[PDB]
């Protein structure tokens, strides 16, 4: 298969151990998220530094981001946001969310800034609708917030050769100079000096991402050393597989999909097992919070006591509930609720300003 | 020396004609600046587009800029600012001034932002001290104003391949990506959409430049076409020569007049180091007369002496041999000394409040152009 332990050894990452989990549960006074307990988020760099930092200072922040997509977001895009929701609540720390509308403009030849803004505003609604805590969240668009990032971006630029940018990101000489210099803007928010309205300088940053992003993220950590700032901490997730195989539109669950569209996609296109190869069981590892129910389902399926139609039906109900709750939350959002996410001066955020 | 008409034909610029000058005097209800009348600013691209636009709408703006220098500014650095002072007053339009502190940080490996800010603040004081009108001036640091430039910068970036940037500016693969992408930030202020606090969209921009900068400025005009925005208008100046030779441009502190120089330092530099177009003996000078094209003092008086009659009278007497080198050098020293002392006095009097006002984009006097 994928062999993630081989990939850890290759990249030089570290496994998240049982003791890391115990330590998280202890520091947050709460059970660890199922993504961590089930090995969905499975590796890290410098997690001990972060846990020890939080233990002594009760302080860090979480950085994540989103390039605005041309199509509707699908379930795979929300996975990291569900994890950030958990992190912000369990640790009680700020979450900053970059919308890289500039990146989308620079990388898509026929897209205008105006059109990209319509996509950005829709994505923001989906992001908020996972149930993020408004009081501990700061969302920003790069087009609007660049002035706060720029002094940091300059320092990152100065320490990144063209060779390094091209080698790391696979750019070529026909690529526009926006693409070439964009990565600094994605690195910058790892450094708390980019958020002077509510963070102190040089506060550690936790950045959840896919294991596949580690080679790119190494540039952030190398740059931090040259800037004499903390290296951003990373926890890595496995690839969430498409419906058709664990290794087009019928390969994902869009958040705008109806109950009937979800039913058909799972029944017709989701691969059936063998727990390791059954896509429905795999998705239940992400979506089912109750450990006992998951193990009971896994027990019955492997023994043959549960058929494929039944495990697919359980997934469809779970998915349908999730998607309908999401659609319901999104529909209820007011412009005032949305704007509040973009406010850097919230008193709950400003608590961390002198920590 | 430098054949400027040949250089016009080579670059594809246009001469500023006597009729352009008449048209400027008519539109401003005032005599044209001596730099224009004496051919110091001598060529242009799209000046008629600008004059026609002003005639109908009474509106454009002026863009200039300054990379913060490691040393004190000298007289040559102020020349374009004296011209922008005239333009803003005669036309009654805004002047925006870019301080490219970001550029200096990106291109000088051992300079910090903090150190560059010290240089920037001192340069700003020298710029203001030419007598710029606070009400029609907007100064900005790129480090502070980048957020307003960024959407425009993105569009410029998107229209510029890495190949094009590297070929045009001579970058290599060891250059940092800040250098590679910086030129867009220098182009951006040619487009009025960068100043939404006080300018309408797609308002024409006038950019005074040395003739030597035209090849680089063509990139701004080409980008404007791809953005479907007005091309920035340019008026070009001749090279201002250093003290030692008309063919050579600005130990080597004796080739320029620093703005921190004392009256005595100026006296000595002119007397000892300024090139004379006069005869080597008094008798030789009386018989053969002085050479105006090569006398540095006469050339500098072309920049500094506002009264035409006095300049022509001085030029008449020197060329005939009726005025000696010592006398024309003395006239220049008095003129320079007065200029530099006024400057030093103005700079010393500047308050933090006066300086801050230059950086305010919401001045009611600037905002009058917002719907024009």
UniProtKB/TrEMBL annotation, chain A:
<protein>
    <recommendedName>
        <fullName>tryptophan--tRNA ligase</fullName>
        <ecNumber>6.1.1.2</ecNumber>
    </recommendedName>
</protein>
<dbReference type="GO" id="GO:0004830">
    <property type="term" value="F:tryptophan-tRNA ligase activity"/>
</dbReference>
<keyword id="KW-0067">ATP-binding</keyword>
<comment type="similarity">
    <text>Belongs to the class-I aminoacyl-tRNA synthetase family.</text>
</comment>
<dbReference type="GO" id="GO:0005737">
    <property type="term" value="C:cytoplasm"/>
</dbReference>
<keyword id="KW-0030">Aminoacyl-tRNA synthetase</keyword>
<dbReference type="GO" id="GO:0006436">
    <property type="term" value="P:tryptophanyl-tRNA aminoacylation"/>
</dbReference>
<keyword id="KW-0648">Protein biosynthesis</keyword>
<keyword id="KW-0436">Ligase</keyword>
<keyword id="KW-0963">Cytoplasm</keyword>
<dbReference type="GO" id="GO:0005524">
    <property type="term" value="F:ATP binding"/>
</dbReference>
<keyword id="KW-0547">Nucleotide-binding</keyword>
């Amino acid at each position: 298969g994928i062999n993630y332990n081989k990939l850890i050894k290759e990249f030089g990452c570290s496994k998240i151990t049982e003791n890391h989990i115990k330590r998280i549960e202890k520091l947050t006074n709460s059970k660890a998220h199922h993504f961590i307990r089930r090995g969905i988020f499975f590796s890290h760099r410098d997690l001990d530094f972060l846990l020890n930092y939080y233990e002594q200072h009760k302080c860090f922040y979480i950085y994540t981001g989103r390039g605005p997509s041309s199509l509707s977001m699908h379930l795979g895009h929300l996975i990291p946001f569900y994890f950030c929701k958990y992190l912000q609540e369990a640790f009680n720390v700020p979450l900053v969310i970059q919308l890289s509308d500039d990146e989308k403009y620079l990388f898509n030849q026929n897209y205008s800034l105006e059109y990209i803004n319509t996509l950005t505003n829709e994505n923001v609604k989906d992001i908020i609708s996972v149930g993020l805590n408004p009081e501990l969240t700061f969302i920003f668009k790069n087009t609007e917030y660049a002035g706060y990032l720029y002094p940091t971006v300059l320092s990152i630029h100065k320490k990144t050769t063209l060779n390094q940018s091209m080698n790391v990101f696979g750019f070529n000489h026909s690529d526009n100079i926006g693409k070439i210099s964009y990565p600094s803007f994605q690195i910058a928010p790892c450094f708390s000096q980019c958020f002077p309205n509510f963070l102190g300088k040089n506060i550690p940053c936790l950045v959840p991402q896919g294991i596949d992003q580690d080679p790119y993220f190494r540039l952030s950590r190398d740059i931090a050393v040259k800037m004499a700032l903390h290296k951003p901490v990373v926890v890595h997730s496995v690839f969430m597989p498409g419906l058709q195989g664990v290794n087009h539109n019928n390969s994902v669950i869009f958040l705008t999909d109806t109950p009937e569209q979800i039913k058909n996609k799972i029944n017709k296109y989701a691969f059936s097992g063998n727990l390791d190869k059954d896509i429905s069981y795999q998705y239940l590892r992400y979506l089912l919070e109750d450990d006992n129910k998951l193990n009971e389902i896994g027990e019955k399926y492997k023994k043959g006591e549960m058929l494929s139609g039944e495990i697919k039906k359980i997934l469809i109900d779970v998915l349908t509930e999730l998607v309908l709750k999401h659609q319901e939350k999104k529909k209820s959002l007011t412009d005032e609720e949305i704007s509040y996410f973009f406010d850097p001066n919230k008193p709950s955020l400003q608590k961390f300003k002198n920590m």
